[PDB]
From Swiss-Prot, chain A:
<protein>
    <recommendedName>
        <fullName>Circumsporozoite protein</fullName>
    </recommendedName>
</protein>
<feature type="repeat" description="28">
    <location>
        <begin position="30"/>
        <end position="33"/>
    </location>
</feature>
<feature type="repeat" description="21">
    <location>
        <begin position="2"/>
        <end position="5"/>
    </location>
</feature>
<feature type="repeat" description="26">
    <location>
        <begin position="22"/>
        <end position="25"/>
    </location>
</feature>
<feature type="repeat" description="25">
    <location>
        <begin position="18"/>
        <end position="21"/>
    </location>
</feature>
<feature type="repeat" description="30">
    <location>
        <begin position="38"/>
        <end position="41"/>
    </location>
</feature>
<feature type="repeat" description="24">
    <location>
        <begin position="14"/>
        <end position="17"/>
    </location>
</feature>
<feature type="repeat" description="32">
    <location>
        <begin position="46"/>
        <end position="49"/>
    </location>
</feature>
<comment type="similarity">
    <text>Belongs to the plasmodium circumsporozoite protein family.</text>
</comment>
<feature type="repeat" description="23">
    <location>
        <begin position="10"/>
        <end position="13"/>
    </location>
</feature>
<comment type="function">
    <text>Essential sporozoite protein. In the mosquito vector, required for sporozoite development in the oocyst, migration through the vector hemolymph and entry into the vector salivary glands. In the vertebrate host, required for sporozoite migration through the host dermis and infection of host hepatocytes. Binds to highly sulfated heparan sulfate proteoglycans (HSPGs) on the surface of host hepatocytes.</text>
</comment>
<feature type="repeat" description="29">
    <location>
        <begin position="34"/>
        <end position="37"/>
    </location>
</feature>
<feature type="repeat" description="27">
    <location>
        <begin position="26"/>
        <end position="29"/>
    </location>
</feature>
<feature type="repeat" description="22">
    <location>
        <begin position="6"/>
        <end position="9"/>
    </location>
</feature>
<feature type="repeat" description="31">
    <location>
        <begin position="42"/>
        <end position="45"/>
    </location>
</feature>
<feature type="repeat" description="33">
    <location>
        <begin position="50"/>
        <end position="53"/>
    </location>
</feature>
Length: 53, 224
């Protein structure tokens, strides 16, 4: 009833390559909360071209 | 309501310059950004340029970047587009358009389009058309219906107007859209179906008119 220490330790190539539909859909609270330095630094062409007003 | 009126379009030789204007009414022109968008049969709808409400930011399509300059006069409520170094492929219908009002972080496009002004870039010279009769005969008769017409060939530029019997004949008239030929001259045909029992007795004359050259031609079509 124990684990065979010499069993297959590799990764089964014929495993599940799709996405798990029941996986975590929530937002991860302890994720990256800082800004990204290599984000988009250029102005947006399709931004607001009018007044506030 | 909102109204946009383009002006300044016409025929221009390649390498010359042209200034289009767009008069706006029905809203505060100085509060909105504007687009210029062109449409051609070969490329469909194609965005050209955008300008901010205050002119601080301008953007252009890659095919026109460095040649066109968009500007505006908020005191006159007028939008301008100076087009330099025009190429043949710039022939299209040009519309000015108003950006819609939205939220601060949304993306933006246009909601109201202008009327449009046609620009034709060609080195062809102004030339009146040749009107030739498409004469009906036994080879163009099926039953009691016959077909006759007029071929309006080798004219420049667009457009030309065709009427039949000074406008008295409109039932069964088909004026085809003009096609541009390799020579830069346009050509089209106009056909009409008539009762075969009227051939040889009823007179059919097509009236081609071209105001830019003051051309007026009344061509009679007789059977063979």
């Amino acid at each position: 009833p124990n684990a065979n220490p010499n069993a297959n330790p590799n990764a089964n190539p014929n495993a599940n390559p799709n996405a798990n539909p029941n996986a975590n859909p929530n937002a991860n609270p302890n994720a990256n909360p800082n800004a990204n330095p290599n984000a988009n630094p250029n102005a947006n062409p399709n931004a607001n071209p009018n007044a506030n007003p | 309501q909102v109204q946009l009126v383009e002006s300044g379009g016409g025929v221009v030789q390649p390498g010359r310059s042209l200034r289009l204007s767009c008069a706006a009414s029905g809203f505060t022109f100085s509060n909105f950004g504007m687009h210029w968008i062109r449409q051609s049969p070969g490329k469909g709808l194609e965005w050209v340029a955008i300008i901010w409400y205050d002119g601080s930011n301008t953007y252009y399509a890659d095919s026109v970047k460095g040649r066109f300059t968009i500007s505006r006069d908020n005191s006159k409520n007028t939008l301008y587009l100076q087009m330099n170094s025009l190429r043949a492929e710039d022939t299209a219908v040009y519309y000015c358009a108003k950006v819609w009002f939205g939220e601060s972080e949304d993306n933006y496009s246009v909601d109201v389009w202008g009327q449009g002004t046609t620009v034709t870039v060609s080195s062809a010279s102004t030339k009146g058309p040749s009107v030739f009769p498409l004469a009906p005969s036994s080879k163009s008769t099926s039953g009691g219906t016959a077909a006759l017409g007029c071929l309006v060939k080798d004219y420049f530029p667009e457009p030309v107007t065709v009427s039949w019997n000074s406008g008295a004949l409109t039932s069964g008239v088909h004026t085809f859209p003009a096609v541009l030929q390799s020579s830069g001259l346009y050509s089209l045909s106009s056909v009409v179906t008539v009762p075969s029992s009227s051939l040889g007795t009823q007179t059919y004359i097509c009236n081609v008119n071209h105001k830019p050259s003051n051309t007026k031609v009344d061509k009679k079509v007789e059977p063979k």
